[PDB]
């Protein structure tokens, strides 16, 4: 509640880049006089928890994959997957792994997680050949094609991405019976961060 809010007010997730786009009008509160938009974060919070409630519905978490093509999203996604039961892929995405059933890796999931649809549009594209729902960490300018759960947040900031995935994992663990809601955590956001 208040402590959870204090644990994420200090970051830079509030700030969203320019190019307002059209389908993020609801999520953007206004454009600052400088020219940079700001997210409500009061929509981000329950978008986070509903994304978690649909992640937890997958019986085996290894059936959910998380992708990121950015250097400071790679650490976040790998550590998020390790802390939850999911298995993630970072860096370069080979563009056949969702539709080509012969290649040795394949690994078709039941749910996809995307750090930035602009940067990894390939995975978002391939999800529409296999009925993968796709949750995306959408920014003020990110396209919303083939994404169902838009999380309005910053996709550039290393701290923004790290906190984003950290509280996503924390909320999925809360939805699990692993730890009670009230108890404070012992895993630091800087640990999720990028070195």
């Amino acid at each position: 509640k208040e402590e959870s809010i204090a644990k994420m007010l200090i970051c830079k997730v509030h700030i969203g880049t320019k190019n307002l786009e059209n389908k993020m009008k609801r999520y953007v509160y206004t454009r600052a006089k400088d020219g940079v938009h700001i997210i409500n974060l009061a929509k981000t919070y329950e978008k986070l928890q509903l994304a978690a409630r649909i992640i937890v519905a997958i019986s085996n978490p290894a059936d959910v994959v998380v992708v990121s093509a950015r250097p400071f999203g790679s650490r976040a996604v790998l550590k998020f997957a390790q802390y939850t039961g999911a298995q993630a892929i970072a860096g370069r995405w080979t563009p056949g792994m969702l539709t080509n059933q012969i290649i040795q890796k394949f690994t078709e999931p039941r749910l996809l997680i995307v750090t930035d649809p602009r940067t990894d549009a390939q995975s978002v594209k391939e999800s529409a050949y296999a009925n993968i729902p796709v949750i995306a960490l959408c920014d003020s300018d990110s396209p919303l094609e083939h994404v169902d759960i838009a999380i309005p947040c910053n996709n550039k900031g290393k701290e923004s991405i790290a906190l984003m995935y950290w509280l996503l994992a924390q909320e999925v663990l809360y939805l699990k019976g692993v730890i009670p809601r009230s108890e404070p955590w012992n895993v630091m956001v800087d640990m999720f961060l990028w070195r």
Partner: peptide, 28 residues
């Protein structure tokens, strides 16, 4: 891949802008 990256992994592991301010004060 061998037994050299694990030790380095262990070594490596260990007011506000006014529009945001009014946004937060509106929210609560």
């Amino acid at each position: 891949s061998l037994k050299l990256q694990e030790e380095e992994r262990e070594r490596r592991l260990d007011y506000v802008e006014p529009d945001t301010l009014r946004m937060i004060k509106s929210l609560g």
